[PDB]
């Protein structure tokens, strides 16, 4: 129950899972807490300790704003931090199978949340099922989000940007140096993450400092080329100083703005994060990844285009209704408590909310490409069109474009299309297969029969868990034993992808082809 790490001993705890045992090490620190003079700076090496660190409970989440739009609603509150917020939050978790494995493949989870929210202690990121069922080791880490993790004064070590990504990177290196003692194989490490976590995984594929820290990569509903994933150096500067004046720390010695921002309390920085953008959207990433010249040496679309990334296998995918969740966060006529039938005029109003800095012509171009119906009667159109608009633009086609360009350099790629709405989904049915609701199936929560899932959901998750594990172990996301559909490699010519659902697992081609050609070629010009 005790493991000796390179900086000290850690005590874990035993968990009963599916008539077996999983050993959990919740809340191991991997960096010196970024407090006081270290706020906004890269994570620092952790001083060795002499006692037994008790890693028997999730540690603090990093400071962050909370989704308060539906108090008491499990559909939104399940994503809010389930542990204390604090700047002392650079910790990680380890689930190892019992008995202790000998050279187990390691899965490292990076949570999403728009680079402003999220925590690894969430119930749907519980790594005990993966450890139990597939005998892999699951690692997850907390990393700073929001301005505390991504405030950027480019070149300035007081606030260089991408600190949260560097938290992630330091956690990966912790796995490199320590996971063998847990029975993990440091040479068989697969990163996986969702949304901003997935975009973070994609940026680790491009960051040279991360190329030796992992083997393979899984990208769930996200990639760096998504329009929300990377902040310009222009916007970054304009935004760190908008925060400065909003907190009354505007100076000319740029270093002196940071020391002044370092004395304001976390909540004051949190409450001003929202107003630093002129017109926000429900997908606004006020403080995100930037081209810092350290973690990210160039603009990532160029690195992707010119083949500058770790050459390895990727597993990429999206859900059928990526965009619906965001429409009840500002789009008029929408609500989780009715079926949100909206007019043409409300649809047009919705575009101005999701594309506020977009010209009149650009917004008409979106309307034109998405509102030439197969059929004019049906009242659900403008409602579903707006969801497809936000979904295709923000997630699906950035992911497809990332997979096309990555695969063009000779690596095996696998694309999935998750289209099962969970039986336990608390959101209304018109939102469909929502953003983030493939995660519970990936972590194998439907495998616990005591948690209200249908047996078809247990079987789908069990296959997904096997495919994910086989990809991590072997670079190939097949289920070989139960006469399952083979998952074909995604090539840029034919673009085959695999659909994931309870009934029919089928091979299709060229997902959302007509929609993405608009989004990836025409729309970036407007
Ligand atoms: C860059 O930032 C300026 C300043 O932002 C304003 O001040 C901040 C403290 C915060 O309160 C923001 O909400 C403010 O917008 C932006 O300039 C403002 O632009 C909007 C309209 O576009 C409007 O509030 C004011 O006319 C402007 N204020 C000033 C002082 O110029 C600017 O739009 C941002 N973006 C760019 C590209 O410059
Ligand atoms: C779906 O509901 C929204 C509003 O939700 C509820 O209704 C409000 C009266 C209020 O009690 C909220 O707290 C509820 O959650 C409807 O949008 C409203 O539509 C009318 C139009 O005149 C008006 O109340 C507001 O302008 C709208 N509010 C908005 C856009 O936020 C919407 O019409 C409903 N749709 C259907 C099909 O029932
Ligand atoms: C006030 C602080 C919390 C605000 N949220 C957590 C934001 C997070 C976020 C910002 N930018 C992003 C880009 C891409 C993906 C996510 C984000 C925006 N949404 C309000 C997410 C809320 C919904 C997300 C979808 C999953 C389930 C339904 C819930
Ligand atoms: C670390 O934990 C030691 C053992 O704690 C054991 O496990 C926990 C979950 C409780 O059930 C406790 O009663 C058990 O004995 C402690 O003896 C030790 O004091 C702890 N040290 C610190 C610094 O917390
Ligand atoms: C684990 O596997 C790697 C290769 O994947 C090998 O180099 C290493 O020696 C193995 N460690 C063991 C078996 O303890
Ligand atoms: C203010 O001056 C320069 C930047 O102009 C900087 O090097 C210096 O460190 C700043 N002052 C302090 C006390 O850091
Ligand atoms: C294959 O089917 C058996 C039952 O025939 C089931 O117990 C097992 O979990 C399945 N394996 C996978 C990987 O789905």
Curated annotation (Swiss-Prot):
One annotated GO biological process: peptide hormone processing
Native organism taxonomy: Eukaryota, Metazoa, Chordata, Craniata, Vertebrata
Gene Ontology CC annotations of this record: blood microparticle; endoplasmic reticulum lumen; extracellular region; extracellular space; nuclear envelope lumen; plasma membrane
Keywords: Disease variant, Disulfide bond, Glycoprotein, Hydrolase, Phosphoprotein, Secreted, Serine esterase, Sialic acid, Signal
Documented effect of changing residue 198 to T: In BCHED; enzymatically inactive in the plasma
A single MF term (Gene Ontology): acetylcholinesterase activity
Tissue: Detected in blood plasma (at protein level). Present in most cells except erythrocytes.
Top-level EC class: hydrolase
UniProt cross-references to InterPro entries, sorted A to Z: AB_hydrolase_fold, AChE-related_enzymes, AChE_tetra, CarbesteraseB, Carboxylesterase_B_AS, Carboxylesterase_B_CS, Cholinesterase
Activity: how regulated: Inhibited by mercury. Inhibited by Tabun. Tabun forms a covalent adduct with Ser-195 that becomes irreversible upon aging.
PTM field: N-glycosylated. No other PTM detected. The major N-glycan structures are of the complex diantennary type with 1 and 2 N-acetylneuraminic acid molecules (Neu5Ac) making up approximately 33% and 47% of the total N-glycans, respectively. Only low amounts of fucosylated diantennary N-glycans are detected (approximately 2%). Triantennary N-glycans with or without fucose amount to approximately 13%, whereas 5% of the total N-glycans are of the oligomannosidic or hybrid type.
Protein name: Cholinesterase
One Pfam match: COesterase
Principal subcellular localization: secreted
């Amino acid at each position: 129950i005790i493991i000796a790490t390179k900086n000290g001993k850690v005590r874990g705890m035993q968990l009963t899972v599916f008539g077996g045992t999983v050993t959990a090490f919740l809340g191991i620190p991997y960096a010196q807490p970024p407090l006081g003079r270290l706020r906004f700076k890269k994570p620092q090496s952790l001083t060795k300790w002499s006692d037994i660190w008790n890693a028997t409970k999730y540690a603090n989440s990093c400071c962050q704003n909370i989704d308060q739009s539906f108090p008491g609603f499990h559909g939104s509150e399940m994503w809010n931090p389930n542990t204390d917020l604090s700047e002392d939050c650079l910790y990680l978790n380890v689930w190892i199978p019992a008995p202790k494995p000998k050279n187990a493949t390691v899965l490292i989870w990076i949570y999403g949340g728009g680079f402003q929210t999220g925590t690894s202690s969430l119930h749907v990121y519980d790594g005990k099922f993966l450890a139990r069922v597939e005998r892999v080791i699951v690692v997850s880490m907390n990393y700073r989000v929001g301005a505390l993790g991504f405030l950027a004064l480019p070149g300035n070590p007081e606030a260089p940007g991408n600190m949260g990504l560097f938290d992630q990177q330091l956690a990966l290196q912790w796995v490199q140096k320590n996971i063998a003692a847990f029975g993990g194989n440091p040479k068989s490490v697969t990163l996986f993450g969702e949304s901003a976590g997935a975009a973070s995984v994609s940026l680790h594929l491009l960051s040279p400092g991360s190329h030796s820290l992992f083997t393979r990569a899984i990208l769930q509903s996200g990639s760096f080329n998504a329009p929300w994933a990377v902040t310009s150096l222009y916007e970054a500067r304009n935004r760190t100083l908008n925060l400065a004046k909003l907190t009354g720390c505007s100076r000319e010695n740029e270093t002196e703005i940071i020391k002044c921002l370092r004395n304001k309390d976390p909540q004051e920085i949190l409450l001003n994060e929202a107003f630093v953008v002129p017109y926000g959207t429900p997908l606004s990433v006020n403080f995100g990844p930037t081209v810092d010249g350290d973690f990210l040496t160039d603009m990532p679309d160029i690195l992707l285009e010119l083949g500058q990334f770790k050459k390895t296998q990727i597993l990429v995918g999206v859900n059928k209704d990526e965009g619906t969740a965001f429409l009840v966060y500002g789009a008029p006529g929408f609500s989780k408590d009715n079926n949100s039938i909206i007019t043409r005029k409300e649809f047009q109003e919705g575009l101005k909310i999701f594309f506020p800095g977009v010209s009149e012509f650009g917004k008409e171009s979106i309307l034109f490409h998405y509102t030439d119906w197969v059929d004019d009667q049906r009242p659900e159109n403008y409602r579903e069109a707006l969801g497809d608009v936000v979904g295709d633009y923000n997630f699906i086609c950035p992911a497809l474009e990332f997979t096309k360009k990555f695969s063009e350099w000779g690596n095996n790629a696998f694309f999935y299309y998750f289209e099962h709405r969970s039986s336990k989904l608390p959101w209304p049915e018109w939102m469909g297969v929502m953003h983030g609701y493939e995660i519970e199936f990936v972590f194998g929560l439907p495998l616990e029969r005591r948690d209200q899932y249908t047996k078809a959901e247990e079987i789908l998750s069990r296959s997904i868990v096997k495919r994910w594990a086989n990809f991590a172990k072997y670079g190939n996301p097949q289920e070989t034993q139960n006469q399952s559909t083979s998952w074909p490699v995604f090539k840029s010519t034919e673009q085959k992808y695999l659909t994931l659902n309870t009934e029919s697992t089928r091979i299709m081609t060229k997902l959302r082809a007509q929609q993405c050609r608009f989004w990836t070629s025409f729309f970036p010009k407007v």
